[PDB]
Design an enzyme around this catalytic site. Structure first.
Site, PDB file in Angstrom:
ATOM      1  N   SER A  45       0.776  -1.238   0.000  1.00 54.39           N
ATOM      2  CA  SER A  45       0.000   0.000   0.000  1.00 54.39           C
ATOM      3  C   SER A  45       0.803   1.281   0.000  1.00 54.39           C
ATOM      4  CB  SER A  45      -0.922   0.041   1.196  1.00 54.39           C
ATOM      5  OG  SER A  45      -1.947  -0.915   1.038  1.00 54.39           O
ATOM      6  N   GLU A 143      -7.130  -8.452  -8.183  1.00 54.57           N
ATOM      7  CA  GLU A 143      -6.760  -9.220  -9.364  1.00 54.57           C
ATOM      8  C   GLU A 143      -6.227 -10.591  -8.974  1.00 54.57           C
ATOM      9  OE1 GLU A 143      -4.438  -7.561 -12.483  1.00 54.57           O
ATOM     10  OE2 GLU A 143      -5.316  -5.555 -12.274  1.00 54.57           O
ATOM     11  N   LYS A 209       3.114   6.397   5.378  1.00 51.46           N
ATOM     12  CA  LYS A 209       2.188   5.444   4.773  1.00 51.46           C
ATOM     13  C   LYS A 209       2.783   4.066   4.942  1.00 51.46           C
ATOM     14  CE  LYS A 209      -1.340   3.802   2.655  1.00 51.46           C
ATOM     15  NZ  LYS A 209      -1.263   2.687   3.664  1.00 51.46           N
ATOM     16  N   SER A 210       2.017   3.164   5.535  1.00 51.56           N
ATOM     17  CA  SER A 210       2.465   1.806   5.794  1.00 51.56           C
ATOM     18  C   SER A 210       2.008   0.861   4.692  1.00 51.56           C
ATOM     19  CB  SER A 210       1.935   1.321   7.152  1.00 51.56           C
ATOM     20  OG  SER A 210       0.523   1.316   7.155  1.00 51.56           O
ATOM     21  N   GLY A 211       2.595  -0.325   4.676  1.00 54.94           N
ATOM     22  CA  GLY A 211       2.157  -1.370   3.776  1.00 54.94           C
ATOM     23  C   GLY A 211       2.360  -2.736   4.398  1.00 54.94           C
TER      24      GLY A 211
END
EC number: 3.5.2.6
Length: 263
Positions: A45, A143, A209-211
């Site tokens: 993300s 997807e 912003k983390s992911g």
């Protein structure tokens, strides 16, 4: 940053996984320290900041409006959509979608925004045009996943991401109003508590912003600094670990503690 490098290598040992790391001077763009700066990692993300940068470039050009309302349906909803699942009949504005994508990491919000800019290929072209010839987004959320060994799709490199984030936040690409909006969304990040924020002393500024992803992926991109002003960009990625999220969180937080201690 000798101690921090030691901690980054320790994190690889603890996690049994690769860790990529960079500190970048926000004002000068100089690389202050790095580890695996030119290896690829899944963006997860963290791409959502780049996505909203592309959205804001359209706003600046008069081709998008932050107040424009987008309607969507149940069929658009993908896994982890904490904000968008509340507004099936309301719709959401472009600014509400970027807020949801960045501050809550809402995946449907990111998909909807991707559609507004022409999809993953157009985000990649946006990045290429600003001089990032490495970072690539290839897929919408939801997807079919191929499970390809050493999958190059949806990846970045720590140095590329750091440089690109600096360009978006302080460069001339976006108007100052749009730069400020982008960093304001990142400052309001709600789901990165156990990462760099957990090591951050009182009074410090952070916009991040983390992911997270399968195969042990975990990461964060950030602009941070003491005395309520950002002065440095930090990018940390890891992938491959079998460790729990807590364990990955803790290693990133401990790299953060080292960064702060030896600021």
């Amino acid at each position: 940053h000798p101690e921090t490098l030691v901690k980054v290598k320790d994190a690889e040992d603890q996690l049994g996984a690769r860790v990529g790391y960079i500190e970048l001077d926000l004002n000068s763009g100089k690389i202050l320290e790095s580890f695996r700066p030119e290896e690829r990692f899944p963006m997860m993300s963290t791409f959502k900041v780049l996505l909203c940068g592309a959205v804001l470039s359209r706003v600046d050009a008069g081709q998008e409006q932050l107040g424009r309302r987008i309607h969507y349906s149940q069929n658009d909803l993908v896994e982890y959509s904490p904000v968008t699942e509340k507004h099936l009949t309301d719709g959401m504005t472009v600014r509400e979608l970027c807020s949801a994508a960045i501050t809550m990491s809402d995946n449907t919000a990111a998909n909807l925004l991707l559609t507004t800019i022409g999809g993953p290929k157009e985000l990649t072209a946006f990045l290429h045009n600003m001089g990032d010839h490495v970072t690539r987004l290839d897929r919408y959320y939801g997807e079919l996943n191929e499970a390809i060994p050493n999958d190059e799709r949806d990846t970045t490199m720590p140095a590329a991401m750091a440089t690109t984030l600096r360009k978006l936040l302080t460069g001339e690409l976006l108007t100052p109003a749009s730069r400020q909006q982008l960093i304001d969304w990142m400052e309001a990040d709600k789901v990165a508590g156990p990462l760099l924020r957990s090591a951050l002393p009182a009074g410090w500024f952070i916009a991040d912003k983390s992911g997270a992803g399968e195969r042990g992926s975990r990461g964060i991109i950030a602009a941070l600094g003491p005395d309520g002003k950002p002065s440095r960009i930090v990018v940390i990625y890891t992938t491959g670990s079998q460790a729990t999220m807590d364990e990955r969180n803790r290693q990133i937080a401990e790299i953060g503690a080292s960064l702060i201690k030896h600021w």
